[PDB]
Write a protein that binds this ligand. Structure first.
Ligand code: CLA
Ligand code: CLA
Ligand code: CLA
Ligand code: CLA
Ligand SMILES: C=Cc1c(C)c2cc3nc(c4c5[nH]c(cc6nc(cc1[nH]2)C(C)=C6CC)c(C)c5C(=O)[C@@H]4C(=O)OC)[C@@H](CCC(=O)OC/C=C(\C)CCC[C@H](C)CCC[C@H](C)CCCC(C)C)[C@@H]3C
Ligand SMILES: CC(C)=CCC/C(C)=C/CC/C(C)=C/CC/C(C)=C/CC/C(C)=C/CC/C(C)=C/CC/C(C)=C/CC/C(C)=C/CC/C(C)=C/CC1=CC(=O)C(C)=C(C)C1=O
Ligand SMILES: CCCCCCCCCCCCCCCCCC(=O)OC[C@H](CO[C@@H]1O[C@H](CO)[C@H](O)[C@H](O)[C@H]1O)OC(=O)CCCCCCCCCCCCCCCCC
Ligand SMILES: CCCCCCCCCCCCCCCCCC(=O)OC[C@H](CO[C@@H]1O[C@H](CO)[C@H](O)[C@H](O)[C@H]1O)OC(=O)CCCCCCCCCCCCCCCCC
Ligand SMILES: CC1=C(/C=C/C(C)=C/C=C/C(C)=C/C=C/C=C(C)/C=C/C=C(C)/C=C/C2=C(C)CCCC2(C)C)C(C)(C)CCC1
Ligand SMILES: CC1=C(/C=C/C(C)=C\C=C\C(C)=C\C=C\C=C(C)\C=C\C=C(C)\C=C\C2=C(C)CCCC2(C)C)C(C)(C)CCC1
Ligand SMILES: CC1=C(/C=C/C(C)=C\C=C\C(C)=C\C=C\C=C(C)\C=C\C=C(C)\C=C\C2=C(C)CCCC2(C)C)C(C)(C)CCC1
Ligand SMILES: [Fe+2]
Lengths: 76, 187, 31, 36, 30, 32, 31, 30, 37, 484, 348, 27, 31
């Protein structure tokens, strides 16, 4: 039945998980360090926190054209 | 959201807390944690900055036109200060009271002059620097210190005040206020 | 294997360590 | 099967988690959002 | 005429039907 | 800074001292 | 007197009415 | 007028606390 | 601060406080190693 | 035996008393309706239909009376302003008398059904045990529901036989009861379009008639019979209470957001209209037109209707009261007597300042004066010490046009502060207060109280539907478990 | 079923494969509960590490900005969007996930999927209770958490201007929402809220007193100091001396329980009643219907400058709360309130 | 007549009017 | 609501206390 006792103590289970867990850790490291989260996410970096046009917090103030509005109010 | 790596293992970029800024015919150091406010105080304001925590820690500049030649034509520091009493704030309470004490009759605030100065520029132009304590009857924030600096450009008499709370003055704002005050260079 | 317990454990095992390594990289991100 | 002790496995997992918590608490004195 | 909102509605509904079919397949694939 | 590396190796020395003792005593005889 | 009389009337129409209802139900539930 | 009502209803509340404490239903051991 | 004789020992002494909390953790390790007898 | 929370389960399997208690509940509801609108007519003040409408007096069932077509009264007055020369039999308290006689008839029928409970109609000829033919009963009831919906949508609201409905202009000025033609397109699905209601009820009635016929025809299957606890009347109970708090959430939403059958003139405004500047935008573009072509803001403010300015008031907001600010809105702020005109504030140099409108979320709000460019020029000084924004030193005068005060410019600091505080709430109105002993705070609209009560009732009925679902599926193990 | 042949079909095969013993029970309710709950927890855990609030509330609410666990939050959509559901395909985003995140649409996504997850969890409780046939009082008690969830995450924003006034998914954001009701609504003085807090502290009372009493009036069952092993899973006899408990509480408190069933049912009864009354109170708050002002007390405070009370102190502190709220909590109002108009006391 | 002048007239009063929420992407 | 509170509180006390007392003496009458 393998009730969480023999599984963690099994060398066969440990060997196949000696690669996948570090691979996931390295991929998670690189996903933030390479800025892919910044690219596919839309989150602003601290260097591009503010634009030259506005020194203050952004305001959408719209409901329907908010897509192109956040396009022109984000950090490009 | 263009593709570039994160900032890691390359030391810090800014720690001094001051970010340079220039406007029209002038340039000074502004605090990096302060946010400029759209609340224009006087009718002749070009730039104004303030702290996001408390709006008391604020600063702005004045671009009023001049009719004289220079601040030297204005004369002594006391005579120069005595003409510009609108910057501190007039008392809107007019009823006579003696139940507050320590101040003049029908007065709830006083302007305690903490100092004057005569600072010269690179060649010959003087940078008037003063310090005025602006207390109240209740002593809100333990009073307010007025750090004013003035100079003469090609017209456009430029005044400054770094108004800040007195509790902030001994709780970690005096050095930043002095750094703003001594960097008000007008060319 | 690919059992129900396998999928249930993996769907909460893989992404949490992915974001965990993300936070680990994210702590050392300088200014 | 039982070659690596379960208490040993739990000890390794716990030390990994505790050191990671120490790293995260270290991340409040440096990096982003660390008042510097 | 046919609005982009209505087009997105049609795409969302056929996507939901695809999701339902995928749920059925995943539960019948033991 | 050398103090950081020696801090980390001292931390390694103090985090490994316990498990090494308990593992060696678990594999060598008993009476623990 | 416009509402104190209302309160007096309310107390008079309830308190003995409630007392009578207590006694009546105490007898009615016993066979 | 409100103070009388507050006092009366609160002393009634504490009195019925007393009633529930002492004049309660005695449980049976059977 | 540290003197001239003990100057490189600051990273050594920097680790000293965590000994008792790591020690109660060691006690948990030993009780887990005796299989919670 | 049965505890106090199970008393009505004495009539779970007795259809005669089930019909009887339904009849007497119907009687009590009809009697309450009649008594409530009698009380509302007794306490209603028709003195000013514009500045003191029914929703400013806390009238609750009367706006619903005026929604379906009953507008006149036997007292010789109609809420729209006209005089009911021949109001007819169907007045407000005439409908009350109809409700009362219906309640009496229903109560007598309830007593009859209680005393005559052993009716062979509830006994099936197969075995003689107590049973109800639930599929055919539902088919019949759905057929009657479809027939009534189709009739109400084909004759009442169409006006070929009935009175139609109350339709108002977008800003709620005129208002009238008239027949409405059906809207068979997407405009019929426009929630603010009254042309969809006849089409909605006609299509719903046709579909209900067909569904009831199919139910009368085809019997259900064994699988759903043993799944949904079909054999228990409690399944019908759980499904029906599910439907009614569905409808409760529907009515709460449509009352809070406004729709075609929710007129502002009858049920009060919405807080979203105030937060969206609807009446203010209407007034100001009615000023822009006829000000851009001469006849400037000195006059033509009297051209602005007084109802519109009453609508542009935060005291008219339905979300400005409290949980316990109890009663009529007039008992809250006084009855409006007249409009003093739009306040125009000007400072010492000449720019026109404006007072900031009060957000609905605040009970109190500071008074500030902002320029056209959006930066505050003055404020009511709290500190008044080392303050350089006060009106006493800025020099702002207030002027009024088109109202009881027209062309009058006040320069005194106390009165300009007071009228700025009054204009903080929106338009400027005078309220009579000593006639009803007004406390001062704002009350809530009948629409707001309706929405609050129905939201609470919908939550309670969601709990009831969960409990009855448990009761339906678990009818076998109530008293205990199988212990094996 | 029902002594008829009942030829096995797709429904029968699905039911037989679904209601069975596993490590995680799938059943029919797992068709909704598992995907909806998985999506909700994934969206929230993604939001507290990734989603910036700089374009929704103009704040920082994730670990990518340097926030900690509490200040990280899935932030609500902007009030300009009103009560829009903010679909990724809808007119707000139109298929663009990247800017759908910046719109705050995942707030509505996660709230919707969490409501469906609550529905699926209650349905899972009902399905398990049907599968092995005992009363569903767990679902009866679970009726109150979903009431709270609906009444604070949907009813309040739908009654107010929009989702911006709805709470955001995050501990410090919940704290902001809590102080928002403290200032704007006087939620402490609300009667239904006092009903709820009384019920919840009484639930804590009953839980603590029941656990302590049971563990303190236990029978012997021993010959060993570890009483935990004194209990056997298969026995039909009492393990704690209830009559001793009744005597102890009759002599300590004056009243005591004479029934385990009524004791446990009242233990169930107190928090469900408290949470339902709190839900009704926040439902009342959803339409700006508050227990804010006591009319007579505010009147006598107005015509009496000496009449100071704690209630009037609370009222004044609340308008101070709101005066400091408006500017930095309502960007879409852009309330540029100056420093002087802010109410404040002497010194400080 | 001009919608821009009434826009700047509604703005100091409130910043949530529907006409301010529509076609304000130019600002 | 100075004395409307009186009549409301009065009836809110009266109706449940009379109801509960009636059904209680129904219980206690039968032993
Ligand atoms: C348990 C399955 C399930 C359920 C019940 C839901 C339910 C829901 N989702 Mg969701 N979703 C799911 C799985 C599910 N989802 C999965 C697996 C994913 C990952 C791909 C998503 C990703 C997702 C996103 C990104 C979003 C939703 C959203 C929504 C909500 C609105 C959906 C909508 O707008 O149209 C409703 C869809 C249906 C009713 C599907 C039913 C299909 C009908 C009955 C058939 C009609 C189609 C038919 C083929 C027509 C073509 C005819 C032609 C051939 C002539 C809704 C409550 C939206 C939301 O949360 O709002 C904020 C949203 O943006 N979902
Ligand atoms: C029309 C809907 C409806 C109907 C027909 C029923 C019918 C029934 N329910 Mg039920 N219930 C409902 C809705 C409904 N319920 C709702 C919405 C809830 C959530 C609050 C409940 C919660 C509930 C519980 C917890 C229980 C029942 C029970 C019962 C059964 C016995 C009732 C009884 O004798 O208690 C007697 C009730 C009283 C003696 C007085 C109740 C009145 C209270 C105190 C408020 C007074 C209201 C006021 C006078 C009138 C306001 C009405 C108006 C605002 C709508 C019965 C068949 C019981 C059961 O299932 O048996 C095991 C059970 O214990 N119901
Ligand atoms: C759908 C239900 C409903 C709704 C929405 C309304 C709405 C309204 N009613 Mg009405 N009413 C109703 C049912 C309803 N009523 C019923 C069933 C009756 C018969 C008893 C009445 C009898 C009635 C009268 C006589 C009057 C009104 C009035 C009003 C208006 C004034 C606001 C108000 O009610 O005060 C505030 C609302 C509340 C405070 C709600 C209370 C919330 C709960 C129930 C608190 C109570 C719980 C607690 C346990 C009670 C203990 C208190 C105790 C100590 C005294 C308002 C628009 C007044 C009016 O304008 O004339 C038409 C008026 O004089 N109503
Ligand atoms: C001869 C029948 C009749 C007629 C002509 C009227 C007429 C009227 N009643 Mg009334 N009423 C009746 C019977 C009738 N009633 C009965 C039998 C009762 C006891 C239950 C009531 C109880 C009652 C009350 C409490 C009140 C009225 C009120 C009113 C007046 C306004 C109606 C209103 O706004 O409410 C709105 C009516 C509706 C919204 C009807 C909606 C029907 C629901 C939503 C059906 C949906 C479910 C359905 C099964 C769906 C079918 C499925 C489909 C696919 C087929 C109006 C003049 C009001 C009034 O002002 O007092 C005088 C009011 O307070 N009545
Ligand atoms: C904040 C306090 C609090 C939390 C966190 C909590 C948590 C829980 N309660 C449960 C149960 C219950 N709650 C109950 C009574 C109560 N619960 C209470 C208070 C709480 N209960 C109170 C006060 C009562 C008294 C009435 C009952 C009666 C039950 C159960 O039946 C059940 C149980 O067995 O208890 C152990 C569990 C099942 C939830 C689940 O899987 O749903 C499935 C759905 C999921 C996971 C989707 C939810 C996603 C949410 C809605 C949206 C995203 C939110 C983020 C994940 C987190 C945001 C956090 C920030 C806001 C700070 C869960 C661990
Ligand atoms: C002049 C005067 C009088 C001055 C004082 C005035 C004053 C200020 C008055 C205000 C006070 C007042 C009443 C205000 C509060 C108003 C308000 C909030 C009302 C409360 C409303 C209320 C009904 C809440 C409903 C919500 C809800 C149902 C909670 C009820 C909580 C409740 C009663 C729980 C039980 C609490 C508790 C004490 C538990 C004891 C139970 C008990 C004896 C268990 C012991 C026990 C354990 C065992 O394990 C076994 C085995 C046995 C056998 C056993 O027994
Ligand atoms: C005890 C039970 C009653 C408690 C409330 C008493 C109110 C006192 C009062 O003044 O009443 C009397 C008030 C009238 O109050 C008076 O009205 C006058 C004009 O009519 C004046 O305006 C007065 O100023 C005003 O005091 O009217 C009522 O009867 C209140 C209506 C109660 C029902 C309101 C809707 C509730 C709907 C749902 C709530 C329940 C939700 C589910 C459960 C939770
Ligand atoms: C309980 C059992 C069920 C449990 C969980 C079920 C979960 C459901 C999750 C979805 C809930 C509905 C979300 C969308 C609703 C919505 O957007 O409404 C908001 C929209 C209206 O949208 C608003 O309209 C206003 C009109 O003046 C304004 O223009 C606002 O700016 C605009 O945002 O209405 C709807 O589309 C649906 C309304 C009907 C639903 C009623 C629910 C309760 C409503 C209360 C209203 C206040 C009181
Ligand atoms: C017999 C007779 C008659 C008469 C009749 C009548 C006269 C009736 C009536 C009646 C009436 C006159 C009625 C009324 C009523 C009322 C009601 C029915 C009510 C109620 C209730 C409720 C439901 C409430 C609740 C509540 C409270 C308590 C408070 C507030 C809150 C609440 C809501 C909770 C006739 C001639 C016809 C015929 C022959 C004989
Ligand atoms: C002076 C000095 C010294 C000494 C010291 C001492 C005196 C001692 C010790 C020691 C120690 C002290 C060691 C240790 C270690 C430990 C560890 C490493 C731990 C652990 C654990 C964990 C991590 C976990 C656990 C758990 C829990 C709690 C839960 C459940 C179960 C488990 C098991 C999982 C030396 C020489 C070093 C050098 C330097 C200085
Ligand atoms: C978003 C989204 C989505 C979904 C997703 C999913 C469904 C998934 C997931 C996911 C997840 C699910 C994630 C996660 C995370 C997690 C975490 C981050 C964790 C944690 C924990 C912690 C950190 C703790 C630790 C500890 C310590 C250290 C101490 C002691 C012990 C304990 C354990 C407590 C998609 C893409 C579809 C699209 C739409 C949106
Ligand atoms: Fe127990």
């Amino acid at each position: 039945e393998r009730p969480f006792s023999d599984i963690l103590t099994s060398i066969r289970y440990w060997v196949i998980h000696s690669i996948t867990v570090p691979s996931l850790f390295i991929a998670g490291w690189l996903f933030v360090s390479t800025g892919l989260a910044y690219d596919v996410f839309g989150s602003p970096r601290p260097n591009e926190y503010f634009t030259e046009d506005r020194q203050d917090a952004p305001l959408i103030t719209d409901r329907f054209n908010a897509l192109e509005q956040v396009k022109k109010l984000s950090a490009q | 959201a263009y593709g570039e790596g994160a900032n890691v293992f390359g030391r810090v970029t800014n720690k001094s807390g001051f970010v340079p800024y220039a406007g029209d015919s002038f340039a000074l150091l502004l605090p990096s944690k302060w946010n400029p406010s759209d609340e224009k105080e006087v009718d002749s304001i070009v730039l104004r900055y303030a702290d996001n925590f408390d709006a008391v820690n604020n600063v702005y500049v004045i671009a009023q036109d001049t009719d004289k030649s220079s601040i030297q034509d204005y004369g002594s520091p006391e005579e120069f200060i005595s003409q510009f009493g609108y910057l501190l704030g007039r008392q809107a309470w007019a009823g006579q009271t003696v139940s507050e004490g320590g101040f003049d009759a029908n007065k709830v605030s006083s302007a305690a002059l903490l100092g004057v100065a005569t600072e010269k520029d690179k060649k010959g132009k003087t940078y008037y620097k003063f310090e005025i304590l602006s207390r109240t009857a209740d002593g809100n924030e333990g009073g307010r210190h007025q750090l004013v600096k003035a100079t003469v450009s090609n017209g456009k008499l430029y005044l400054l005040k770094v108004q800040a709370g007195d509790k902030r003055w001994f709780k970690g704002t005096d050095k930043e206020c002095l750094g703003v005050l001594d960097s008000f260079t007008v060319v | 294997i690919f059992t129900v317990r396998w999928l249930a454990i993996h769907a909460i095992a893989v992404p949490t360590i992915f974001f965990l390594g993300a936070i680990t990289a994210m702590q050392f991100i300088q200014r | 099967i039982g070659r690596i002790p379960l208490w040993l496995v739990g000890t390794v997992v716990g030390l990994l988690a505790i050191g990671l918590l120490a790293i995260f608490f270290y991340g409040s004195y440096v990096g982003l959002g660390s008042s510097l | 005429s046919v609005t982009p909102s209505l087009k997105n509605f049609l795409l969302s509904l056929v996507a939901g039907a695809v999701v339902l079919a995928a749920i059925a397949g995943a539960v019948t694939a033991v | 800074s050398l103090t950081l590396i020696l801090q980390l190796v001292a931390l390694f020395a103090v985090v490994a001292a316990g498990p090494l003792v308990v593992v060696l005593l678990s594999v060598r005889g008993g009476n623990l | 007197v416009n509402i104190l009389g209302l309160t007096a009337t309310a107390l008079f129409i309830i308190i003995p009415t409630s007392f009578l209802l207590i006694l009546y139900v105490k007898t009615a539930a016993s066979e | 007028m409100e103070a009388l009502v507050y006092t009366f209803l609160l002393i009634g509340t504490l009195g019925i606390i007393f009633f529930s404490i002492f004049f309660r239903e005695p449980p049976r051991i059977a | 601060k540290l003197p001239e004789a003990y100057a490189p020992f600051s990273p050594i002494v920097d680790v000293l406080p965590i000994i008792p909390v790591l020690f109660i953790l060691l006690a948990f390790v030993w009780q887990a190693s005796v299989s919670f007898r | 035996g049965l505890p106090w929370y199970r008393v009505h389960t004495v009539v779970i399997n007795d259809p005669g008393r089930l019909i009887s208690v339904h009849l007497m509940h119907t009687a009590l509801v009809a009697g309450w309706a009649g008594a409530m609108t009698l009380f509302e007519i007794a306490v209603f003040d028709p003195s000013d239909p514009v500045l003191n409408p029914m929703w400013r007096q806390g009238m609750f069932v009367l706006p619903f009376l005026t929604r379906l077509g009953v507008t006149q009264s036997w007292g010789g007055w109609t809420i729209s302003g006209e005089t009911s020369s021949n109001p007819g039999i169907w007045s407000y308290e005439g409908a009350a008398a109809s409700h009362i006689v219906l309640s009496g008839l229903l109560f007598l029928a309830s007593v009859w059904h209680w005393v005559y409970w052993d009716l062979e109609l509830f006994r099936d000829p197969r075995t003689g045990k107590t049973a109800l033919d639930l599929p055919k009963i539902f088919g019949i009831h759905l057929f009657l529901a479809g027939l009534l919906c189709f009739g109400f949508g084909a004759f009442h609201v169409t006006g070929v036989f009935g009175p139609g409905i109350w339709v108002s202009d977008p800003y709620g000025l005129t208002g009238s009861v008239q027949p409405v033609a059906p809207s068979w397109g997407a405009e019929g699905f426009d929630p603010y379009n009254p042309g969809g209601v006849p089409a909605h009820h006609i299509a719903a009635g046709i579909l209900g008639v067909l569904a009831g016929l199919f139910h009368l025809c085809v019997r259900p299957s064994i699988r759903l019979y043993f799944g949904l606890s079909m054999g228990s009347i409690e399944s019908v109970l759980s499904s029906s209470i599910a439907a009614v708090f569905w409808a409760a959430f529907v009515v709460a939403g449509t009352m809070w957001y406004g729709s075609a059958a929710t007129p502002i003139e009858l049920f009060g405004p919405t807080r979203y209209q105030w937060d969206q500047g609807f009446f203010q935008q209407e007034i100001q573009k009615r000023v822009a037109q006829s000000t851009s072509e001469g006849l400037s803001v000195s006059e033509a403010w009297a051209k602005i209707p007084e109802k519109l300015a009453f609508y542009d008031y935060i005291g008219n907001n339905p979300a400005k009261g409290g949980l316990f600010r109890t009663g009529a809105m007039n008992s809250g702020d006084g009855i409006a007597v007249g409009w003093l005109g739009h306040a125009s504030f000007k400072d010492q140099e000449g720019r026109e300042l404006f007072v900031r409108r009060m957000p609905t979320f605040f009970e109190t709000f500071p008074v500030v004066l902002i320029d056209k460019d959006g930066v505050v020029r003055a404020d009511v000084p709290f500190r008044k010490a080392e303050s350089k924004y006060s009106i006493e030193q800025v020099g702002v005068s207030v002027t009024f046009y088109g109202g009881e005060l027209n062309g009058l410019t006040f320069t005194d600091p106390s009165t300009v502060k007071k009228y700025a505080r009054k204009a903080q709430l929106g338009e400027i109105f005078e309220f009579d207060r000593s006639t009803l002993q007004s406390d001062g705070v704002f009350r809530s609209s009948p629409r707001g109280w309706f929405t609050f009560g129905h939201l609470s009732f919908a939550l309670l009925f969601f709990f009831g539907h969960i409990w009855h679902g448990s009761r339906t599926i678990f009818r076998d193990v109530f008293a205990g478990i199988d212990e094996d | 079923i029902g002594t008829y042949q009942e030829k096995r079909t797709w429904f029968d095969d699905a039911d037989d494969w679904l209601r069975q013993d596993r490590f995680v029970f799938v059943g029919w309710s797992g068709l909704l509960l598992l995907p909806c709950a998985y999506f909700a927890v994934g969206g929230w855990l993604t939001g507290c590490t990734f989603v910036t609030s700089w374009y929704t509330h103009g704040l920082a609410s994730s670990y990518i900005e340097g926030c900690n666990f509490l200040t990280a939050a899935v932030s609500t959509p902007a009030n300009s969007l009103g009560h829009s559901l903010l679909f990724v395909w809808g007119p707000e985003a139109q298929g663009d996930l990247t800017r759908w995140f910046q719109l705050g649409g995942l707030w509505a996504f996660v709230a919707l999927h969490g409501a469906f997850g609550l529905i699926g969890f209650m349905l899972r409780q009902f399905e398990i209770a049907r599968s092995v046939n005992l009363r569903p009082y767990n679902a009866i008690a679970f009726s109150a958490p979903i009431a709270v969830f609906v009444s604070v995450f949907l009813i309040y924003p739908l009654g107010q201007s929009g989702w911006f006034f709805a709470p955001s998914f995050g501990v410090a954001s919940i704290f902001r929402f809590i102080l928002f009701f403290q200032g704007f609504h006087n939620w402490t003085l609300n009667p239904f809220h006092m009903m709820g807090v009384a019920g919840v502290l009484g639930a804590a009372l009953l839980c603590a007193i029941h656990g302590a009493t049971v563990e303190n009036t236990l029978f012997e069952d021993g010959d060993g100091a570890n009483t935990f092993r004194a209990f056997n899973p298969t026995q039909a006899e009492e393990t704690y001396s209830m009559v001793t408990a009744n005597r102890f509480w009759s002599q300590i408190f004056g009243v005591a329980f004479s029934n385990k069933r009524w004791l446990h049912f009242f233990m169930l009864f107190v928090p469900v009643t408290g949470l339902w009354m709190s839900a009704l109170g926040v439902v009342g708050l959803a339409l700006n219907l508050r227990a804010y002002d006591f009319v007579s007390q505010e009147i006598r405070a107005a015509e009496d400058p000496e009449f100071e009370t704690f209630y009037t102190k609370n009222i004044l502190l609340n308008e101070g709360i709101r005066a400091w709220m408006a500017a930095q909590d309502q960007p879409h109002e852009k309330l540029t309130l100056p420093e002087e108009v802010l109410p404040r006391g002497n010194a400080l | 007549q001009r919608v821009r002048t009434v826009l700047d007239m509604d703005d100091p009063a409130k910043e949530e009017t529907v006409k301010e929420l529509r076609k304000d992407i130019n600002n």
